[PDB]
Amino acid sequence: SFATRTSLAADLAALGLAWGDAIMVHAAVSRVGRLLDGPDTIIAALRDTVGPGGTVLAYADWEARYEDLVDDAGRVPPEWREHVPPFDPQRSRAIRDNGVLPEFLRTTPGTLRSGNPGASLVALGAKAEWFTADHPLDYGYGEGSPLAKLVEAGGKVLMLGAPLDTLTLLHHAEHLADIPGKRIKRIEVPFATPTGTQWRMIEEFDTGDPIVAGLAEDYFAGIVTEFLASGQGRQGLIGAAPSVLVDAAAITAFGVTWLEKRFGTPSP
Amino acid sequence: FATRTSLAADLAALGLAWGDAIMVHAAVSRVGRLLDGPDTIIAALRDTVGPGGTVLAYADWEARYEDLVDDAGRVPPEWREHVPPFDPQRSRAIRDNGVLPEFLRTTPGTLRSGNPGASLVALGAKAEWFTADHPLDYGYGEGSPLAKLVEAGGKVLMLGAPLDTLTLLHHAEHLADIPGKRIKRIEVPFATPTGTQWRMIEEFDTGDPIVAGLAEDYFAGIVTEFLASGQGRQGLIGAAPSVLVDAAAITAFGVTWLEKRFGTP
Numbered sequence: 001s002f003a004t005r006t007s008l009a010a011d012l013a014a015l016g017l018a019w020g021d022a023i024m025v026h027a028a029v030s031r032v033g034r035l036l037d038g039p040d041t042i043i044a045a046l047r048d049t050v051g052p053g054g055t056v057l058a059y060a061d062w063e064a065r066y067e068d069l070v071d072d073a074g075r076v077p078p079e080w081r082e083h084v085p086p087f088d089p090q091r092s093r094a095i096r097d098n099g100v101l102p103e104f105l106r107t108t109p110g111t112l113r114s115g116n117p118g119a120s121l122v123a124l125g126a127k128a129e130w131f132t133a134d135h136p137l138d139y140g141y142g143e144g145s146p147l148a149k150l151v152e153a154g155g156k157v158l159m160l161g162a163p164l165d166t167l168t169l170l171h172h173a174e175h176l177a178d179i180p181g182k183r184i185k186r187i188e189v190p191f192a193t194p195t196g197t198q199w200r201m202i203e204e205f206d207t208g209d210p211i212v213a214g215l216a217e218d219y220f221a222g223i224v225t226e227f228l229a230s231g232q233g234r235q236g237l238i239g240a241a242p243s244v245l246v247d248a249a250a251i252t253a254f255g256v257t258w259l260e261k262r263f264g265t266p267s268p
Numbered sequence: 269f270a271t272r273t274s275l276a277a278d279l280a281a282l283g284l285a286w287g288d289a290i291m292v293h294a295a296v297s298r299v300g301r302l303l304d305g306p307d308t309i310i311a312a313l314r315d316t317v318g319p320g321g322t323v324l325a326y327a328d329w330e331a332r333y334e335d336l337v338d339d340a341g342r343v344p345p346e347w348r349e350h351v352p353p354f355d356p357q358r359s360r361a362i363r364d365n366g367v368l369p370e371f372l373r374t375t376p377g378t379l380r381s382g383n384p385g386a387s388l389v390a391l392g393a394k395a396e397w398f399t400a401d402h403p404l405d406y407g408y409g410e411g412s413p414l415a416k417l418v419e420a421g422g423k424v425l426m427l428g429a430p431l432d433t434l435t436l437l438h439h440a441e442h443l444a445d446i447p448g449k450r451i452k453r454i455e456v457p458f459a460t461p462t463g464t465q466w467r468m469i470e471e472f473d474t475g476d477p478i479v480a481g482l483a484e485d486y487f488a489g490i491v492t493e494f495l496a497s498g499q500g501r502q503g504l505i506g507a508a509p510s511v512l513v514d515a516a517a518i519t520a521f522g523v524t525w526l527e528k529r530f531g532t533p
């Protein structure tokens with residue numbers, strides 16, 4: 001009844017994960033079933049399937065409880081400024097909303113973590129340095145971001161039993177979409193540096209809610225559901241977890257088209 | 269919000285001092301709302317104790333393979349090379365001990381000793397010494413990290429944790445001169461470059477009391493008697509009722525406690 005490193009690797013190959021792939025994972029680890037090495041079995045199986053030339057990624061974000069204290073400008077009151085732990089890509093935890101897997105991947109030796117805290121990705125493998133280098137601090141889900149690099153490299157996204165609305169790459173589609181009324185987030189962020197804490201205003205399209213008004217919180221799940229119903233992507237079990245594997249470029253373009261058909265003015 | 273500074277003040281108020289080697293057993297949920305989660309506790313401990321001190325915790329490890337028993341403690345041959353081997357840098361801390369040992373283990377600079385079931389994690393001035401050369405047999409006895417904590421005059425902090433989780437009292441069980449001590453043997457897999465390598469580990473069993481006739485949680489009674497004798501300190505760390513005891517004192521108290529009942533003075 002134990003799911004092993006070998007058995008999960010076989011499930012991953014059966015679903016379409018291939019040697020050399022760059023694979024970003026969204027997991028609901030409890031749905032995989034009985035795991036012999038806990039969540040680390042999932043990470044190992046992904047690395048076994050993808051080989052030393054591939055890369056395993058996950059969405060990290062970070063635990064910034066201090067955001068409950070910021071004013072309407074997104075700035076930290078002076079009374080709290082020196083009590084807020086600054087972001088350090090090597091020490092700051094992955095956000096707890098994203099599950100156990102991003103944090104377990106972050107603390108796997110060799111894993112790198114990009115520099116934009118809220119948009120940070122973790123990467124482990126051959127192109128981890130490229131994925132995590134020079135993450136732009138403003139609009140960190142757009143051009144030059146790890147998500148943009150995942151599309152460029154022909155990477156893939158694996159929903160390992162996770163709800164389909166957690167597909168972070170669709171925030172990149174939100175950034176690219178040519179639509180009016182895009183919601184913007186501004187937040188002050190402290191960065192750990194060799195000379196001490198540096199504070200910096202971060203501006204981006206807001207990813208805590210849909211990019212524009214008139215959308216349900218989980219409307220990403222609808223985009224993926226329509227994507228799968230249209231015959232794109234792959235479906236199958238990884239352990240006990242029903243899973244979907246999609247092409248990063250395909251789901252991004254589908255998401256942009258989806259948004260621009262509904263709120264934009266598309267071509268034909 | 270409870271902050272790094274306020275928790276460090278609570279720790280100093282309770283008796284944690286500059287340069288101390290402090291071993292922590294925590295129930296993080298009782299400390300209250302923390303601005304940097306459990307890492308605030310680790311930071312406050314290092315701030316209170318300073319660069320000359322050391323922060324420690326009991327790591328153990330998740331050896332779910334132990335559920336594939338055989339009563340002599342051996343892994344069936346079909347599983348011997350599917351069992352995840354112990355790697356001191358990569359194996360997780362056991363989850364029975366709470367989130368704090370694992371958060372401390374993955375703090376950069378933290379080291380972890382080589383006896384998997386008895387493994388301690390240490391961060392600070394003497395972390396390399398504390399975690400070095402952990403004997404594979406009787407890893408709660410002489411030359412162990414727990415013995416080194418006693419030797420260094422360290423302290424143990426029960427940070428809202430149930431008092432029976434005080435791992436150092438297993439060292440008192442090892443030291444106690446008493447008959448009928450129960451012994452555990454188990455096969456343990458170690459990760460090596462050429463594949464998994466095995467070690468038969470022998471130790472006094474720490475899953476149950478050292479001898480028969482004791483309550484499962486009798487460590488908590490020992491700590492209560494220790495405090496009732498006027499030793500150690502109690503107080504709040506954040507919202508967490510806490511106990512701070514001297515490692516050498518509680519060990520000697522524990523040895524005497526066991527030797528009054530089953531041994532001889």
Ligand SMILES: CC(C)(COP(=O)(O)OP(=O)(O)OC[C@H]1O[C@@H](n2cnc3c(N)ncnc32)[C@H](O)[C@@H]1OP(=O)(O)O)[C@@H](O)C(=O)NCCC(=O)NCCS
Nearest residue numbers: 026027028029030031038097098099100101162163166363
């Ligand atoms: C929210 C969500 C994570 C909840 O799913 P979940 O499986 O219940 O939570 P996790 O993924 O962290 O899995 C936890 C499992 O891993 C194990 N686990 C967790 N921490 C562990 C630890 N320190 N040691 C050993 N095992 C551990 C546990 O066995 C646990 O299973 P259990 O509670 O049944 O015993 C999931 O629905 C999801 O959304 N995943 C994608 C997250 C994401 O990418 N979000 C992006 C922002 S929208």
Ligand SMILES: CC(C)(COP(=O)(O)OP(=O)(O)OC[C@H]1O[C@@H](n2cnc3c(N)ncnc32)[C@H](O)[C@@H]1OP(=O)(O)O)[C@@H](O)C(=O)NCCC(=O)NCCS
Nearest residue numbers: 096293294295296297298305364365366367368429430433
């Ligand atoms: C079993 C025991 C750990 C349960 O106490 P607990 O406080 O409920 O569990 P933890 O210590 O791991 O604290 C978890 C808290 O830290 C936070 N936390 C846990 N994981 C987190 C994560 N990835 N990110 C951010 N915060 C996290 C949570 O806020 C959680 O509190 P909540 O779930 O109530 O909201 C405790 O009773 C105990 O025995 N501690 C001593 C253990 C020991 O040393 N045993 C020795 C062997 S006998």
